[PDB]
Amino acid sequence: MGRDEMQMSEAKRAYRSAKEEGNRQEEARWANVIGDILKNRGEYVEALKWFRIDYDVSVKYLPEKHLLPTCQSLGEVYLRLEHFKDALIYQKKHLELAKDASDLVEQQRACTQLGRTYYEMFLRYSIRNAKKYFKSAMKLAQTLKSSFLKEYIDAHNNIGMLQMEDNLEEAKKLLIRGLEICNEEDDDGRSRLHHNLGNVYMELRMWDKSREHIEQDIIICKKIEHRQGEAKGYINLGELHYRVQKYDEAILCYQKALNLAQSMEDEDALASQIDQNIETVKKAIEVMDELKKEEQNLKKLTRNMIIAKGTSQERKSLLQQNASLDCLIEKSSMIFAWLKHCEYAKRKKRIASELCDKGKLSDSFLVIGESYQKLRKFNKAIKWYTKSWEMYKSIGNLEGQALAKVNMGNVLDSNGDWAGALDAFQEGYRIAVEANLPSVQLSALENMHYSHMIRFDNIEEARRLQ
């Protein structure tokens, strides 16, 4: 970046010169160039200034063709400023200007960018358009096919990325395939490919492999000197450490990402989400301290039951131990420490079975089944979930059956049974409505609408939202 000092002076020189000679086309070409340097420096408002004046020179004196790249860059900067409506305006004008000329390549670019803006809106109808434009972009990169290599690999990248936000396996396939294409022929595409690969891996719970991939995304961003890049690589390495109970490393990676974000003038929102993450981990640390204090309390109650066995203080200390275990599963489930959750759930089931309680035993069955699903141990999860369902049947519990059915459907979905998943959601709604419990109906409706929204059924989903 030792060359970005004079490389601006020469471009500002050429802009003032095309202004002094009335070379309108080169006024606008150099306005674009300088706006692009400003964009690559994180100066998005100041990029918008001489992207607006490039747009204006093109509209005033230049043919319509000039409007086509300028609308892209303009629509890009609005995206990085979190101005989505504003982006979409020029993004769509870009698509129009590319269709009326039918050059296909620019039509690919406009579709990739449309899919980007919609994907980014949805995390904050949107998923439908996102999938539509990402798929169209992939098809327009296949049609374009050492010619459109970048666009092809990038379209693979974006389509794989769209998959996981719950099709982890096809995302795995697409991203690994794109990386294979890269090796078949230190690139900025490998950055995002490694990035989303580590993200899907850490969703599949394989930490070390996700660690490796996130780690090289960081390294490659350090080499390219892509500051925002390694800010996102550090924020995801911090996510890795946070999900695996390593909080001090998490705050280290989050502070590093903060320093990267705060060195750019117009990356304010990323720095605010980094601050938000840092305080979330700070709060989880207190939650963990509560965990460990109640664990010590549990050790004391265990020594009290060992001494008061058969005394009828055995049952009292047993229910005290059940209460401690319930507090413990609650704290263990706020933070995402699902292994401790499984521990506490299992020990709750052992002391419910000893206490000859059907209700507590059904609850411990539900919590052990949730603990097993959140590990992505789906078969063991459905076995414990049906255990809890059939135990809730034997007693006068309709809530429990509804809960067990809904969560069982969640497991079914995440295993690839979209059909049985929604069927279980709807059965859960059946029991839910049949027992006049409002919140379980709400949750069942929420996953029903989810199942339908991910299946592109607008009418049904919009009806459930009501």
């Binding site: 670019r109 960018q113 990325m161 989303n196 995801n236 993450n277």
Partner: peptide, 28 residues
């Protein structure tokens, strides 16, 4: 999705791919 019955969840980050060209190339 939704688990039926205050969790502490951090925000992750994703990386989309830009379009490959919005820049203009002047003459000199």
């Amino acid at each position: 999705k939704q688990t039926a019955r205050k969790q502490l969840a951090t925000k992750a980050a994703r990386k989309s791919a830009p379009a490959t060209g919005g820049v203009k190339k002047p003459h000199r």
